[PDB]
Amino acid sequence: GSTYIFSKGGGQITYKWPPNDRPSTRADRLAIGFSTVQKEAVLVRVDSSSGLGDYLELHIHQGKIGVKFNVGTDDIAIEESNAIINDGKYHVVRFTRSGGNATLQVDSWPVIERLAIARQRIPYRLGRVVDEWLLDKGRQLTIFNSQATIIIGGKEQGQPFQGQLSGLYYNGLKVLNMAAENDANIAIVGNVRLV
Ligand SMILES: *[C@@H]1O[C@H](CO[C@@H]2O[C@H](CO)[C@@H](O)[C@H](O)[C@@H]2O)[C@@H](O[C@@H]2O[C@H](CO)[C@@H](O)[C@H](O)[C@H]2NC(C)=O)[C@H](O)[C@H]1NC(C)=O
């Protein structure tokens, strides 16, 4: 609903949990709509408190949307490698995590149906789901500990997002809506504006 345009030079929307409600979770739900033409960008990153490795990162690499996270132990990647999503068009991404398991869903509305065939078409929903499962007898770690910041825009990774982000949802937090409503725990910097 609340859409922010990240213009030339990039920008950043930061949400800081009250230093005293910093959550630790077994499961996560993230949703965001986006449009971009970028080959590479970081869209959203949830980092833990200083001194901890835990993080969750939504990014685009080689035109493809994916999420990388760490919850103690190994870095875990889930990527949707069939859709090229950097076409300046709208897409919705949905990510869930349960311990080391993870699901990623990417919806798109292509207007083309393919010796491929350039057939202009009525746009239709094309959904892709990827599930990643780990099979140890509950052996690796499962908790994203002490979540401190949700940073939207990718500047801190040296990979700024340019284009449109909307409708961010994270564990009950409608972060871009809270930004729009001038939430005390949100800071906006750079070339970012509310549509
Ligand atoms: C992460 O996932 C494992 C495995 O999940 C199960 O295995 C298949 C993998 O494709 C999946 O399709 C099924 O939905 C199924 O849930 C979970 O561990 C398994 O589930 C139960 C406990 O709910 C155990 O009794 C099983 O023995 C165990 N299977 C194996 C092979 O280890 C695990 O709980 C889950 N992690 C979290 C935190 O949700």
From Swiss-Prot:
Binding site for Ca(2+) 3: 54, 71, 143, 145
Residue ranges constituting the Laminin G-like domain according to the UniProt record: 4-192
Subcellular locations according to the entry: Presynaptic cell membrane
PTM section of the record: O-glycosylated; contains heparan sulfate. Heparan sulfate attachment is required for synapse development by mediating interactions with neuroligins and LRRTM2.
Disruption phenotype: No visible phenotype, but mice display subtle behavorial deficits. Females show deficits in nest building and taking care of pups. Mice lacking the alpha-type isoforms of NRXN1, NRXN2 and NRXN3 are born at the expected Mendelian rate, but die during the first day after birth, probably due to neurological defects in the brainstem that impair normal breathing. These mice express normal levels of the beta-type isoforms of NRXN1, NRXN2 and NRXN3. Mice show reduced density of synapses in the brainstem, especially a reduction in the numbers of GABA-releasing synapses.
Glycan-bearing residues: 101
Superkingdom of origin: Eukaryota
Function: Cell surface protein involved in cell-cell-interactions, exocytosis of secretory granules and regulation of signal transmission. Function is isoform-specific. Alpha-type isoforms have a long N-terminus with six laminin G-like domains and play an important role in synaptic signal transmission. Alpha-type isoforms play a role in the regulation of calcium channel activity and Ca(2+)-triggered neurotransmitter release at synapses and at neuromuscular junctions. They play an important role in Ca(2+)-triggered exocytosis of secretory granules in pituitary gland.
Family recorded in the similarity comment: Belongs to the neurexin family.
Subunit details: Interacts (via laminin G-like domain 2 and/or laminin G-like domain 6) with NLGN1 forming a heterotetramer, where one NLGN1 dimer interacts with one NRXN1 dimer. Also interacts (via laminin G-like domain 2 and/or laminin G-like domain 6) with NLGN2, NLGN3 and NLGN4L; interactions with NLGN1, NLGN2, NLGN3 and NLGN4L are calcium-dependent. Interacts (via cytoplasmic C-terminal region) with CASK (via the PDZ, SH3 and guanylate kinase-like domains). Interacts (via cytoplasmic C-terminus) with CASKIN1 and APBA1. Interacts (via laminin G-like domain 2) with NXPH1 and NXPH3.
Record protein name field: Neurexin-1
